[PDB]
Amino acid sequence: GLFSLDRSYEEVKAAVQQLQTITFRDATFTIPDPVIDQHLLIDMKTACLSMSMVANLASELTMTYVRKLALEDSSMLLVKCQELLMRLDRERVSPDDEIARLSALFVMLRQLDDLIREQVVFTVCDVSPDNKSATCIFKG
Amino acid sequence: HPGFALTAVRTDTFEVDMLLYSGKSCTSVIINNPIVTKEERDISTTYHV
């Protein structure tokens, strides 16, 4: 889905084509392209946008608070966290807007949770030679 | 010896046999027949009265 805007390039076409074919135990079916008619549908576009927006926001947001907590921290993981942000920084504000920015991060994080957490509905113990049928214990 | 005269406070606990008097029919205890409750498991069952 994220490659939707670079589809005009041969590299992206090859990457997407290699992506579609998923290989599993004696199965080699292809998953259909979520991009159709050179366009993307609204919910998938919203998922990609929220994902990328969370990832972009976190970088700027966490840096101001990590140094304060590291000043307060005694377990040193926040200090190494600030060092990680320092190396990221080398590699590359009003208060109400700050509050709205944190709120935006978390409110769009709410949307993303659906794709982030798969749920198990059945686990199996019986398989037939009629294998298209099986017995499972149920969970919810 | 410094210029203070601290005093100690401590508690000793004893184990004791008591006697108790009460007048006849000084209070009435009223009761009902015990109520039985069942709780079930595959391994075992327990009964509460």
Binding site: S74, M76, V79, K80, Q82, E83, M86, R87 | -
Partner: protein, 46 residues
């Protein structure tokens, strides 16, 4: 002013008892007095 070069770009705050790790706690006066006393001691003892 730089003679020490460090891999880690941000220092950590010291913790735990001295029996767990080796650390260099070092007042300037202590080190200077140690050096100035040791220098003459080596000279003492064709």
């Amino acid at each position: 002013m730089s003679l020490l070069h460090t891999f880690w770009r941000l220092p950590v705050a010291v913790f735990f008892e001295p029996h767990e790790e080796n650390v260099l706690r070092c007042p300037e006066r202590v080190l200077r007095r140690l050096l100035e006393d040791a220098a003459v001691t080596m000279r003492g003892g064709d």
